[PDB]
């Protein structure tokens, strides 16, 4: 197996049993000895997969309005950089049907109902297929693996029937999650340095590459 900056400590517990395993753990965060709460091997893999899943959607969320508005698809005023949509009021904001602080409460309620239910699966595997939830609990029983629930809702197409395809898909998903993680970190770093959006940054670089980079942008 290909190893990227491994160690004796890393290879003791990183044995290839997890998808996207390259023995990379310089700081020993996944060591099973004396591990609990936030720093345990089973919470960290779930956190990696979950964070990659949100980052994968977030990259498209940031890139879609700016790309569509650079074409003639969506109205210009709805095509904004991700930091000018109201998420960062100093950089500008948009006027929606509801106040942003009222939208925050609605999102808080919905997302809380989702995430507390997600957590009770981790803290109690089969718990959420038992109590009445308007009949949806029939498909919210989990699978015993917190990051891979499956079922009628979360895996409706029923892909990865055999083990060899499920493992390959898990590898691809963790790899794309890592790549989108890096992409969103790049977005966050580029936003203050260069005052424009990621797509404008891309276009301005393949127009005159030697005058649009970090070396030039050590001025803002």
**DSSP summary character for residue 82:** G
State the minimum distance, in angstroms, from the CB of residue 89 to ligand CLA: 17
Quote the least distance from Cβ 136 to ligand CLA, whole Å. Answer: 34
Find the binder of ligand CLA among 109, 193, 213, 216 (CB under 6 A).
193
Q: Which contiguous run of DSSP H or E holds residue 46?
A: helix 41-70
Nearer to another protein, 9 or 176 (CB): 9
**Do residues 96 and 103 make contact, with C-beta atoms less than 8 angstroms apart?**
yes
Which SS3 state, helix, strand or coil, does residue 70 take?
helix
218 binds ligand CLA (CB under 6 A): yes
89 counts as binding another protein under rule CB under 8 A = no
90 binds another protein per the rule CB under 8 A: yes
Judged by beta carbon distances under 5 to 8 A according to partner kind, the member of ligand CLA, another protein, none in contact with residue 31 is another protein
Report how far apart, in Å, the C-alpha atoms of 142 and of each of 33, 122, 130, 133, 215 are.
28, 9, 11, 15, 50
**Residue from the set 37, 97, 101, 132 that interacts with another protein by CB under 8 A:** 37
In 169-183, which positions are buried (b, 16+ CB within 10 angstroms) versus exposed (e)? Answer: ebeebbebbeebbeb
Instruction: By CB under 6 A, name the binding residues for ligand CLA.
Output: 192-193, 218, 220
């Amino acid at each position: 197996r290909q190893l990227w900056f491994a160690s004796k400590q890393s290879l003791s517990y990183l044995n290839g049993s997890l998808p996207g395993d390259y023995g990379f753990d310089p700081l020993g965060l996944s060591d099973p000895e004396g591990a609990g709460f936030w720093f345990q091997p089973r919470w960290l893999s779930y956190g990696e997969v979950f964070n990659g899943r949100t980052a994968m959607v977030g990259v498209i969320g940031c890139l879609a309005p700016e790309i569509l508005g650079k074409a003639g698809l969506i109205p210009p005023e709805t095509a904004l950089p991700w930091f000018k949509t109201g998420v960062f009021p100093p950089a500008g904001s948009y006027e929606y049907w509801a106040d942003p602080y009222t939208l925050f409460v609605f999102e808080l309620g919905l997302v809380g109902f989702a995430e507390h239910r997600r957590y009770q699966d981790w803290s109690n595997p089969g718990s959420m297929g038992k109590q009445y939830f308007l009949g949806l609990e029939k498909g919210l029983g989990g699978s015993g693996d917190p990051a891979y629930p499956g079922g009628p809702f979360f895996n409706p197409l029923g892909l990865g029937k055999d083990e060899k395809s499920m493992w390959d898909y898990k590898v691809k998903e963790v790899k794309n999650g890592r790549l989108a993680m890096l992409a969103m970190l790049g977005f966050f770093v580029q936003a203050p340095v260069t005052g424009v959006g990621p797509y404008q940054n891309l276009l301005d670089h393949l127009a005159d590459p030697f005058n649009n980079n970090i070396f030039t942008n050590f001025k803002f």
